[PDB]
């Protein structure tokens, strides 16, 4: 792999700890970096590091070395998983990024309905918002995460939401994302119409997954579109299914989701509309 030396970390002030999970296409192990934070120059730093496992093919390699090149574009915030460095050199793909040790918000929700704590209404809207704002971000950016769930955000000790799992993100100009390929590898019951029939992306596909995620969200980790299989749903949503209004979801929250979901769209909301919706209604909890 070619050298990156702003982002190179040297392998022997990283330690590797206990296993933190793994995937389909790499594991990722909790470690100690020694100096990784310029801030705290003498300090060790607790972080995540992302690598193969050993039955790791060539694809994975290659996804994993875009993943770390796509978080080397998004800029910096605190609402995403910020890479933090890397070892390219000499020894295994070492892909170090901040730790989040309340895992991802999936399971956080579902563990909070013995639960850890209890969600209030306003936990759910403070969570909504700051995930509101990192899209925000990312868009601003000319990112378009193309994959986001629950399952790939992640909490930090102190509760901060962070998008993470980038490799299927990409950068865009102005006009729509398209790329014909046989079939997709997006998760379909997040995915846009346009985005699953037409191959096209935007940032108000996006805007779309982030309805399916606020359902998530107001239904504590539930499963979108509750019993419909993913092989029954393309029908659906041709034919304008939407899902539902969760419980603990209040009317308002609820034309949020489904404005999200408008089959147009130019005539979803966009990330910077959202995230003044939901400071509105966060201010008056
Ligand atoms: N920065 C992190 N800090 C703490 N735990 C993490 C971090 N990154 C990943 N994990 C966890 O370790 C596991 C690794 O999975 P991950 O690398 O995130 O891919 P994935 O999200 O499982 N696949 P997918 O959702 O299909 O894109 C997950 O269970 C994560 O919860």
């Known amino acids: 792999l070619p050298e990156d030396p702003k982002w190179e970390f040297p392998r022997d002030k990283l330690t590797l700890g206990k296993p933190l999970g793994e995937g389909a296409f790499g594991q990722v192990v909790m470690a100690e970096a020694v100096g990784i934070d310029k801030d705290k120059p003498k300090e060790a730093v ?18 994993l070395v875009s993943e770390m090149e796509m978080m080397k574009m998004i800029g910096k915030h605190k609402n995403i998983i910020n890479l933090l460095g890397a070892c390219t050199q000499d020894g295994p793909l070492y892909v170090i990024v901040e730790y989040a040790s309340k895992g991802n918000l999936r399971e956080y929700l579902r563990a909070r309905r013995v639960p850890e704590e ?13 995930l509101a704002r990192g899209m925000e971000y990312l868009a601003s950016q000319k990112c378009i995460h193309r994959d986001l769930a629950a399952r ?12 993470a799992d980038f490799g299927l993100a ?14 997709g590898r997006l998760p379909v019951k997040w995915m846009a119409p346009e985005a699953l029939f037409d191959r096209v992306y935007t ?3 996006d805007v779309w997954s982030f309805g399916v995620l606020m359902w998530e969200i107001f239904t504590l980790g539930g499963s979108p579109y509750p019993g419909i299989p993913v092989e029954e749903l393309f ?6 299914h939407r899902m539902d209004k969760p419980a603990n979801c209040t009317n308002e929250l609820y034309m949020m989701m489904r404005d999200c979901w408008h089959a147009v769209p130019s005539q979803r909301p966009t990330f910077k509309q959202l ?9 008056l909890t």
């Open 203 to 205: 940032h108000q596909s």
């Open 46 to 63: 607790t972080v995540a590091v992302k690598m193969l496992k050993d039955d790791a093919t060539e694809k994975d390699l290659s996804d």
């Open 118 to 130: 209890q969600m209030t209404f306003k936990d759910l809207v403070s969570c909504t918002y700051q």
């Open 235 to 240: 029908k659906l949503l041709k034919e304008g």
């Open 275 to 283: 995230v003044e919706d939901l400071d509105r209604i966060l201010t």
């Open 152 to 163: 790939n955000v992640l909490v930090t000790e102190n509760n901060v939401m962070k998008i």
């Open 170 to 183: 990409r950068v865009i100009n102005n006009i729509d994302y398209y790329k014909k390929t046989t079939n």
